[PDB]
Amino acid sequence: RPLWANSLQFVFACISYAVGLGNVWRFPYLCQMYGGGSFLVPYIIMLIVEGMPLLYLELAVGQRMRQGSIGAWRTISPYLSGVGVASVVVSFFLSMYYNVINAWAFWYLFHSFQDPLPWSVCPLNGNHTGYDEECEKASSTQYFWYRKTLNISPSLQENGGVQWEPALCLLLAWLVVYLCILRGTESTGKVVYFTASLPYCVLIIYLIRGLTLHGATNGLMYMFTPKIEQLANPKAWINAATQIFFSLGLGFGSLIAFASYNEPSNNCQKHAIIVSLINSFTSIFASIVTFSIYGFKATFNYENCLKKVSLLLTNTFDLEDGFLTASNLEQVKGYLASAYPSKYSEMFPQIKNCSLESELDTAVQGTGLAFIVYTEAIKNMEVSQLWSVLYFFMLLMLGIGSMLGNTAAILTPLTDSKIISSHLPKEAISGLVCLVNCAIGMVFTMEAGNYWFDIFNDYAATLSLLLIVLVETIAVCYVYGLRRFESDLKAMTGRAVSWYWKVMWAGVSPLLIVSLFVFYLSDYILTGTLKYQAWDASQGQLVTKDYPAYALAVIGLLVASSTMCIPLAALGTFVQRRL
Template identity: 25%
Template sequence: MSDAQRTTAEPEKREEFSGQLGFILSAIGSAVGLGNIWRFPGVAYENGGGAFMVPYLIALLTAGIPILFLDYAIGHRFRGSAPLALRRVKRWLEHLGWFQVAICFVIAVYYAVIIAWALSYFVYSFGLQWGDDTAGFFTGTYLQLADVGGADPWFTLDFVPAVLIPLVLVWVATIIVLAAGVAKGLEKVNFVFMPLLLLAFGTLVVRALFLPGAADGLNALFTPDWGAMTDPNVWIAAYSQIFFSLSIAFGIMITYASYRKRRANLTSPGFVVAFANSGFEVFAGIGVFAALGFLANQQGVAIAEMDGLSGPILAFVTFPALVSQMPAGGLFGALFFGSLVMAGYTSLLSILQVVSASFQEKFGWTRAQAAIRIGLVAAVFSVLAFSTTTGLIALDTVDQWANNIGIVTSAVVTTVVIGWVLRRTEEMRFHLNAVSTIKVGRWWSFCIIVLGPVVLTYMLVSRIVSLVVDGYEGYSGTYLGVAGWGTIALLVVAAIVLTRMRWRVEPDVFSAWPRNGDKS
């Protein structure tokens, strides 16, 4: 398309959240995901128990909230999804925006599969169909996991119908909501699902607290190991948990903030979202470990002797085992897996909204066109790569690289470029203070310029070294090169290619508001 074919006008008026409550619920819906339920309790238990709350809170205040505010400032000030907003900060930063979009696409492709698993298990709960061997049912009967032995797992096209059917349903529902738009789609889903999630999971937590052995589980989780405070890995675990659970640094909160009204308050809702997310994590930890205490009591073992205290194994192996031991277990299994579906689905919508908004802005697509085209392409990749007999292995590998390398790289580049290269931190702080009731001081600039880059760079380098030296899960270097490092290469190539494509609407005809020096 020639320059003459491009309009020099700004895009039509952006969609907006209906109000502050709609934004807060949607942002919480994005932040509260699968990791809040199945990751935080195990991470806390393994890293000092009650003592972990100290580095966790410090990480929230010095990295989580500051980077969350940075995303808000970029999206709200420059009125666009990640590629458009970052391009308006500095033209060549569009590459970073598309890198974040590519991360979101990759994560969405496999995240939908986990929601499909939870949807299947929601149905299985009513008949406790997993039986006595929950591990065998999950990997054998349900996923039909290929026995790769010492060979490279690679990818097969042996589809698993039990995964494929709910996965298609997840994608159909996702496309419909994205096509409905921000206010009529995303916001309405979160208005329904967030209260339902709290009610369903809250019921489960209350029931777990009254089970035999619940106190033992809570003691295991919250008994502090103060010696862990001197271990650098515990602090890195705290920063990692905050970083990954808040949906920051890969385009989501930039995009969401761009849908706020011009004079919308940013910092107060930001604190609400951050503390609501952390509060739900602690709440989930209480419920999960009270339930684990019951299971340990039934099996006559200590919590420390149990396996599967976090991740998919906790959700799809350990929890079904304890549900089978509970009175009215089917009901509480349905509550647990229903909670996973709702938490995962609201996060999936936010992830894909980043992709949808970016393509709408660059190529002039309508909401419906973006939802259908992106949704169908993502669904095809999702089915081909992750609904097969090697799907679990591929999912685990791609997730490891996309999160620990892709997202952390994005965060490092964002903080270093904004803080050191372009020196735009004070402009972002000015914007936050100009529109917000709670002002941010120079502590915020220090966190963005110094503390954030140092901690995140350490996280990134240590993880790269570990993956290069130790590999991952015993898989061959060839497989990890394709499924792991190949994913990162794909993100980079996508960022370069999409940046070089022409905009249908002129992106640079724009004036940031308020201007530096304005008091209104």
């Protein structure tokens, strides 16, 4: 098969396939969901037991068996043929929803040429005297992201018809990926290389514009302080582990294909670490930028809870203007109780109990933490147009890189069967894949689209990857491993594997993965039903509602039709081999 070049690429392709939107978009949203410093510790713990050794295992297997993501396993024990099919199905389900993020980034970048920015002012109401109702309870940006780009219906039951704009943007994103995948992975080096270098000259610009905002240290002192209370929440730990397995790509059967091409003179033990660390490190970097800007937003909100109330007080019982800042606030709030109890009894239920600890925690909850925050720092700049263009170009580039990786992982085991690459040229295989995925991705752009995106973001990927990384290791180390495997030798010559890698991927990966699995199911089963977060415009705050029935069915099927292929293939061999 074709090969690599310069060598310095292979590691740039791995770095560009791992630094994707699992770090600058999904890690902040997760870290915000579970408390900040209650999501880091698990992260590191994992990364030093279950993220690095399995990456080294995957690269070694992909280098020694010399074949793709399905041919690699058949050559071990033909009763283990399914794992490749599960690893292809998962990558299919992943790309199908992963491209809509690039779609939304295109939509925002397109709208960021107007003036003034459309998410910076709210429309005028039915009598040209004040802003609209949703834009006063909710900020401007939340109104934009929930009612101009999505038109999100307030219930997973009240569905609708295909929207018009974000569908067209999804079409453009698929055309761009299909246009870039016109060269075969075996040689897409240029594009790979370019991504990374790009997406690093921006994050530092936002780190210099973040850490000087007024009220940008409260966000940090929140993102780092730990709470030994949520170190019980099992969803936090299973989400840490799945976060990892999703960020590196362990289980998508892609990394394998990569450490598959590459010439067999590498030193793999030093291309695992140099990848793994960098990945994790970049995530930390992003979580220092966002959870600073976010912090600023929070302080802003709190500042107003002090203006209005104070002004409110200033308006009622009267008081010389400019006399109720912050300290004076409490002062007069106290001196107005013991002086005018006639109206203090009827105003007291109103005084908005608003204090910094809340507005720092429930401000921009949801899947849009990278969209309704980085705007709260773009509508406060010098020349906002150019810098919003910069940030959204960064997101778009990361997404395109990650999608390149995924589509390569799904085309490698399709352009190898001498049957299929016999009556379909190498230009219409990619075409067929992109057309099918764009025609199926039109379910996330309806009026109830964001909920289906939340489902496909929460079950599929994570669960599948988990359930798989276990069969892989138990296949390499107790069916044909350690022995013949440690007999790597002539492959590289690193004389051995260090006895801190034998233990870690023959007797610690399976124990920990099985333990975490049961530890998570012990909560899903007794919880009852599952609950999602709806919009409820009439107030501008997300509420919680329990899932309907068929949504539960689809959650079940997205894990069944992805982790139930291995035993079906085992049965297919046990029963095929009859006569």
